Scaffold this active site. Structure first.
Site, PDB file in Angstrom:
ATOM      1  N   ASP A 119       0.776  -1.245   0.000  1.00  0.00           N
ATOM      2  CA  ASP A 119       0.000   0.000   0.000  1.00  0.00           C
ATOM      3  C   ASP A 119       0.813   1.304   0.000  1.00  0.00           C
ATOM      4  OD1 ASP A 119      -1.960  -1.967   0.171  1.00  0.00           O
ATOM      5  OD2 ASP A 119      -2.476  -1.529   2.253  1.00  0.00           O
TER       6      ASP A 119
ATOM      7  N   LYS B 230      -7.613  -3.378  -2.540  1.00  0.00           N
ATOM      8  CA  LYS B 230      -8.238  -4.047  -1.396  1.00  0.00           C
ATOM      9  C   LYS B 230      -8.821  -3.059  -0.384  1.00  0.00           C
ATOM     10  CE  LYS B 230      -3.898  -4.618   1.226  1.00  0.00           C
ATOM     11  NZ  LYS B 230      -4.358  -3.781   2.366  1.00  0.00           N
TER      12      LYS B 230
ATOM     13  N   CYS C 127      -1.567  -2.742   8.010  1.00  0.00           N
ATOM     14  CA  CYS C 127      -1.532  -3.596   6.834  1.00  0.00           C
ATOM     15  C   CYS C 127      -0.302  -4.508   6.795  1.00  0.00           C
ATOM     16  CB  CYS C 127      -1.649  -2.753   5.570  1.00  0.00           C
ATOM     17  SG  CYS C 127      -3.230  -1.889   5.455  1.00  0.00           S
TER      18      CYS C 127
END
Lengths: 192, 192, 192, 192
Positions: free
Chosen positions: A14, A77, A107
Site C-alpha cells: 500500500d 483491497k 496492513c
C-alpha cells in the site's frame, strides 16, 4: 529461514502517494522500497503490489511502479492484510515473503500474521516500513518479532539473496546498495 | 492470537484519580485508554474495570467512566491481579484480553501472568499502560513479552479488531484514531 | 515463574568495597540491593552472599551487611559463579533465585547460567545489577534474557512477592518502596 | 551453551584493509578483535580467519595478524559465509564458535546462520562486530539473536572462558581486559 531468488516473493504494501504527508520517513521508505523492487526485478523474484481503497487513497507512487517487472500485478483491497484471493497463486510457489510498505502496525502487521499462519516465513524490511506514528512503527516491529517474523534491512536482504560476490547478478544488485539506505531513526542515541 | 470483537475482553486496570500526580504520562494514558473504552463499547466488547482501594486511591477517572457501556461492572480489589472471583465468568467466555492501565510492573503485570496461566492471550496496550517509574514500566513490558504477552499499541489494536475499512463499525472506530495517540516516551531519540 | 516468600532465595553477588570506583551507578545499586536485602529479611527469604577475592577486592559494603539477618552466611570464592558447594543445599529447597550484585556480565551472568542448568528460575534485579562498562551491563541482561532469566526491577519483585495489599507483610515491605528506586540509566531517552 | 578453551573456536571474518574507511567504529573493532585473538592464543583456542576477495579488498589488518596463534589458517572466499569446506574439520571438533568481524548483516550474519544450522553455539562479540551502516549493524544483532545466537561482549567472553581468578592463565588474559573495550555506541543514551 534462508532466502534466495527461487524461494521468495516481494510484497509491496500500500505505498500510495496520498499517504505521503502522514507517514514518518516516507521519502526514505520510497527510496529503500524501490531498491528492493529493482533487486526483485533483477533477481526474477515474483512481486505483488497492493493498494488500499485507491478510490480515496490514490495509486502506488509512480517511481515504484517504474521499477516493477513487465507483468507485475497491482491488486486493490479494503481488507488490511495483503493475503487476499488473487495473491494465493504466487504464495503457493514460494516459502518466503519479503515485506515492504506502510502502517507497519496495520496492513504490514496483519499481512505478516496471515502469512505466518499459512506457514510462510516473513522478512520485514524495517528501513522500508513505517507508520504515521513512531510508536506504532516501533511496536509493530516488536509484535512481528514476537510472532516469528525476521526483522531485517534492505542491504542485508539484497546481499543475503545472492549469497556471495560470485553470484551471476551480484554486480547488478551491488549498484543498488552503493550508498547506504537512508536513515529512518531506528538506532538510539549512544550513552557516553 | 487474532483479536476480534467476539473473542476478546477489555480489562481496565486501576486508573484512579489519586495516581494522577505519580504516574508517568498519566494524562496521555487516560486519553488513550478512553479510545480503547470507546472501541470496546462500539464493537460490543465486554469491559471489566477494577479499582484498588478506591477509598484511598480514588475512583476511576471521570473521562474513562463517561465512555463505559451502560452496565460495565466496576470491581474493587486489594489483590494486585484483576483475576478476581467477579471476573472469572467473563474470562471463561473469551480467548483474548486487551489490557490498559497502571501498576504496569504490578497490577498489570500480575494480571498478565494470571491470564496467561489460564490460557488466555494478553494484548498489552503500551501507549495506555504506565508506572510511577520509567524504569519499572520499561522492564514491565520486557517481562510481559518474556511471559508471552503481546506488546501492542492502541491504533494497532483498534484497526486489528475491525480488520478492514469495510467493517460496518469502521467509520465509528476511525473517529477514535483521527489523530495519533499522544506520545508516552516509548521511542528512543535516534542518532545519525 | 511465580515468586513468593516460600519458594525463593536472594543471592547477593560480590557487592564489595573496592568495586566502588569502577562500577556504573554503584551507590544506586547498593541502595537498591539493600531494599531486596530488607525485603528478604522481612519475608524470611533465605539469603546467600558471596565475596570474590576479598583480600584484593574488600568485603561486602557495610550498608548491605547491616540489613542481613543474624544468621546469613557470607562465602568467599575465586570462581565467578555463586554456585559453589556451600550454596547447594539452599538451592535444593527453592525454585526461584532473586539476583542482585556486580559483574553483570561475569559473576552475575555465570551464576545465572549455572542456576538455570540446575533447573532454577532466575529473576535478575536490573536496577541492582551493574558492570564497569555500560556495554557489558547492557548485553549481560540480553544474554541472561536469552537463556531464560527474567529481567525484573526492585519494586516489581518486592510487590510481586506479596501479591496484594491484604498480605500481612504488605505495609512492612511497602515502606521499602515509598520512594522510587534510584535511576540507573536503563531507559532510553525519548524523541519528541 | 558454556564456552571453555576446549570446546570453542575463534572465527575472525573479513577484517581487511580496504574496509577501514567504510565501517562504523573500525578502529575500535580492530582493538577489540585483537583482544580476542590474543585471548585465543593464550588459551590455545583454535582460530580461523577468512578474507573476502582479497584481490580487491586486501588482506587481514596487520595488527590482527601479529596476534594470531602460530598455526592459524587464513582462507580466501567469495561466499559471504565463513562456513566453507576448509573450515569443516575445525567445526567438527568444537561445540562453540566465538565470532568477530565485519559486515555484521552479511558475512557475520550468514556465517552465524550456517553455524547454527550445523548445531553449533554462536557467541557474537558485539563490540568487535560492525557494519557500514548503524541500522544494518543494529538489526544484524536482532536477526542473530532471533536465530539463537548469543550476543556477548569481549570482556564477558574472555572472563567466561577462564571461569575464575584461579585459572592458570587468568593473570595473562587479565592484562587484555585491564581497560574497558572501546565504546561502539551500543547502549541507548538515557540522560543528556
Amino acid at each position: 529461514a534462508r532466502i534466495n531468488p527461487t524461494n521468495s516473493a516481494l510484497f509491496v504494501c500500500d505505498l500510495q502517494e496520498k499517504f505521503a504527508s502522514n507517514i514518518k520517513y516516507f521519502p526514505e521508505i520510497i527510496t529503500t522500497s524501490r531498491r528492493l523492487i529493482d533487486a526483485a526485478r533483477i533477481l526474477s523474484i515474483p512481486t505483488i503490489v497492493t493498494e488500499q481503497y485507491p478510490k480515496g487513497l490514490g495509486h502506488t507512487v509512480p517511481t515504484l511502479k517504474e521499477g516493477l517487472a513487465e507483468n507485475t500485478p497491482i491488486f486493490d483491497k479494503t481488507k488490511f492484510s495483503m493475503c487476499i484471493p488473487p495473491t494465493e497463486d504466487t504464495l503457493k510457489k514460494v516459502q518466503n515473503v519479503i515485506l515492504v510498505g506502510i502502517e507497519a502496525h496495520v496492513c504490514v502487521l496483519q499481512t505478516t500474521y496471515d502469512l505466518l499462519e499459512r506457514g510462510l516465513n516473513v522478512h520485514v524490511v524495517v528501513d522500508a516500513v513505517s507508520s504515521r506514528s513512531h510508536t506504532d512503527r516501533h511496536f509493530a516491529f516488536k509484535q512481528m518479532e514476537q510472532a516469528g517474523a525476521i526483522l531485517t534491512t534492505s542491504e542485508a536482504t539484497i546481499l543475503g539473496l545472492v549469497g556471495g560476490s560470485d553470484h551471476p547478478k551480484f554486480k547488478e544488485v551491488q549498484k543498488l546498495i552503493l550508498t547506504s539506505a537512508p536513515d529512518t531513526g531506528l538506532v538510539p542515541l549512544s550513552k557516553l
